[PDB]
């Protein structure tokens, strides 16, 4: 259950990351356009049944069951990792863009404060 919840909320976080990426792209384009306009304005078993008895039998089955689950878990684990990679990349790229936008506005402000005098 913990694995499944981690995966689903990781997917949700990725969706949010994509949404913020789109928002920032639109912000950058709008800011550049506005700045330009303003500038232009100017396995069978596990226990050897040596003892027989039921105690061994159940044991064996349990192990097998666990093994199978673990098998599945193996594959599951791999999947849960993969998405993170892509997300990480985004979490890096965004930074670059963000900085530029901020820089742009600051420079614009500076320019707007130097043309007057």
């Amino acid at each position: 259950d913990a694995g499944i919840r981690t995966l689903v909320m990781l997917d949700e976080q990725g969706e949010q990351l994509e949404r913020i990426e789109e928002g920032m792209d639109q912000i950058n384009k709008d800011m550049k356009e506005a700045e330009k306009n303003l500038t232009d304005l100017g396995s069978g078993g596990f226990i050897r049944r040596v003892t027989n008895d039921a105690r061994e039998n159940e044991m064996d089955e349990n192990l097998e069951q666990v093994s199978g689950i673990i098998g599945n878990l193996r594959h599951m684990a791999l999947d849960m990792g993969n998405e993170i990679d892509t997300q990480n990349r985004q979490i890096d790229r965004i930074m670059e863009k963000a900085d530029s936008n901020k820089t742009r506005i600051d420079e614009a402000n500076q320019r707007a404060t130097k043309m007057l005098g």
């Binding site: 396995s43 193996r74 979490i91 963000a98 901020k102 506005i105």
Partner: protein, 63 residues
């Protein structure tokens, strides 16, 4: 049959341990990066708010 199953279980457990460690470190780095961008965007929004307020007051004084 003992050796095959025991070794298979050990291999699966070791692979899970290694991959979980690697992806945990990756998650830690991701968290650091997202915290940095959080502070960066907070500062950017604050500064743009201040700049637009200054522009508004200046233009209203001039007009």
């Amino acid at each position: 049959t003992r050796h095959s199953e025991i070794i298979k279980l050990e291999n699966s457990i070791r692979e899970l341990h290694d991959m979980f460690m690697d992806m945990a470190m990756l998650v830690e780095s991701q968290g650091e990066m997202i915290d940095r961008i959080e502070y960066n965007v907070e500062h950017a929004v604050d500064y743009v708010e201040r700049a637009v307020s200054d522009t508004k007051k200046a233009v209203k004084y001039q007009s």
